[PDB]
Design a protein around this ligand. Sequence first.
Ligand code: 4AA
Ligand code: 4AA
Ligand code: FE
Ligand code: FE
Ligand code: FE
Ligand code: FE
Lengths: 174, 174
Amino acid sequence: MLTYGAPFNFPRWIDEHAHLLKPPVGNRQVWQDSDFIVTVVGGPNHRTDYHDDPLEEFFYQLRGNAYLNLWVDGRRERADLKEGDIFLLPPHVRHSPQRPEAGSACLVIERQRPAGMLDGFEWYCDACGHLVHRVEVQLKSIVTDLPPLFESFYASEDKRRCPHCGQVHPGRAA
Amino acid sequence: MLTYGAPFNFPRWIDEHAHLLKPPVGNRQVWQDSDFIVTVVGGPNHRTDYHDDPLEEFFYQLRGNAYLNLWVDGRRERADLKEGDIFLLPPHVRHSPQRPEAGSACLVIERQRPAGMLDGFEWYCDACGHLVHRVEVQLKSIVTDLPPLFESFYASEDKRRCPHCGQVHPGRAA
Ligand SMILES: Nc1c(C(=O)O)ccc(Cl)c1O
Ligand SMILES: Nc1c(C(=O)O)ccc(Cl)c1O
Ligand SMILES: [Fe+3]
Ligand SMILES: [Fe+3]
Ligand SMILES: [Fe+3]
Ligand SMILES: [Fe+3]
């Protein structure tokens, strides 16, 4: 049987749920309990963290523009997701999704992580560039599991303290 | 490093490769050697086979319309993929993609099958409805591996012979 229901118009779906895409992630999962985690992400979002996904991530910026702050070969790079662009991110490439425009929508598809395969969430110092804090988690929901982690980083100067130059990461207002 | 390159406009990509989407599958893979097998499928295609995919399949009919002939709970059903529709197919639900219109384009995303996880390709009798022939394969390319299988079924009346009512499946002209 069609465990996930019948086909349906995606634009309309997005229009009807536009109001539910809210910060910090701007996340919204289409189907529940599937192997393919299919989501729509809108803006304005609020991310200061770099995600280290053990699996690939597929992107398709359907509406508006956004960009990904990356760490490619040890360098802070930027990959723009112009409306209409698709992109496949290899596993583990660190990325921080910046989606500043309202009414924006990006199709993001990922995979359920097998038990034992953890996702990493990191922060880097804006001063020396050194890694400030890393949290590894067995992710069960890219929708609900994210904010709580960010909250604990923002609420702790000890976590935000760079082990290289003692500079304390801005946190919530970064 | 970005093993799969930078982001790029998808519509333009589709426009520039429209001429390469040819029967019987109408297949065209976007990125090579990735875990997520991302393809675009256009028409007119030619499929008489039902695919039994051990993993989920994501669809997003970007241009034109198409439909999926299915076997849901033992019944020949039809799921229309109207332009703009997205759909997630559970593992193993038998399906036969019908894409009759030229200039059509559907984003289809699937997963690389682990070793030992085989795909099944089946044919059913238009008379009694009984299973006529099944082939299991360790799929390495949903692009190049398909036609050869279909060819061997079409070239054999023995394979096309229904084990229930001796009716011989039409084959190439079905
Ligand atoms: N790429 C993302 C995004 C995004 O692109 O906005 C949001 C949540 C998660 Cl878990 C991601 O991996
Ligand atoms: N759904 C498809 C399609 C399709 O939808 O046309 C083509 C090839 C393969 Cl291997 C598929 O699983
Ligand atoms: Fe991510
Ligand atoms: Fe520092
Ligand atoms: Fe299939
Ligand atoms: Fe028969």
